[PDB]
């Protein structure tokens, strides 16, 4: 597994009820452009960011998705390098607790990411794994069970009330 260079966090809440904090580690050396994008969206430096956004797609035994802070349905989001950016590294493989980039085909990374809650090998080579949950994995296994409707969207919104850096 890659070396962790930086640490970010998400304080999560499901409809007024605080769940806790997800501390994430970032593989800065194996995917510098990608982790930088992530880091700066966590702080909010450029005006926009993951703060107040939600996890619009949660699927038990698979993953939880988020990062659409411009449409909240999974059709939006934007990187700090404009609209989209090429995939830096596709050599790192997925594992439970990994941070990976969600996309729309090759070289279409934006701001949407997912955290895996089970083995997703069939995804290797197509999504840039750029980090791992260092702590707050139980907070992730909590969200995973929340009630969703068709389209796998959370009935009660799962919100990132605060995101930052350590």
């Amino acid at each position: 597994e890659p070396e962790v260079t930086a640490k970010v966090y998400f304080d999560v809440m499901i409809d007024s009820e605080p769940l806790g904090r997800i501390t994430i580690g970032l593989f800065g050396k194996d995917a510098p452009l990608t982790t930088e994008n992530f880091r700066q969206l966590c702080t909010g430096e450029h005006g926009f960011g993951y703060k107040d956004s939600i996890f619009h797609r949660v699927i038990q035994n698979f993953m939880i998705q988020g990062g659409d802070f411009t449409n909240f349905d999974g059709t939006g989001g934007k990187s700090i390098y404009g609209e989209k950016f090429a995939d830096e590294n596709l050599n790192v493989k997925h594992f439970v607790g990994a941070l990976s980039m969600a996309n729309a085909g090759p070289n279409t990374n934006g701001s949407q990411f997912f955290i895996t809650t089970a083995p997703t090998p069939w995804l290797d080579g197509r999504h840039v794994v750029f980090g791992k949950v260092l702590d707050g994995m139980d907070v992730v296994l909590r969200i995973e069970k929340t009630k969703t409707n068709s389209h796998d969207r959370p009935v009660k919104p799962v919100k990132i009330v605060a995101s930052g850096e350590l």
């Binding site: 797609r57 699927i59 698979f62 993953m63 998705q65 659409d68 999974g74 059709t75 939006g76 989001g77 990976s100 969600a102 996309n103 729309a104 279409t108 934006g110 949407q112 997912f114 997703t120 069939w122 995804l123 999504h127 389209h151």
Partner: peptide, 11 residues
């Protein structure tokens, strides 16, 4: 299937 896309979301 089991994909994590941004926009379409298929099988």
């Amino acid at each position: 299937x089991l994909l994590v896309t941004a926009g379409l979301v298929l099988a």
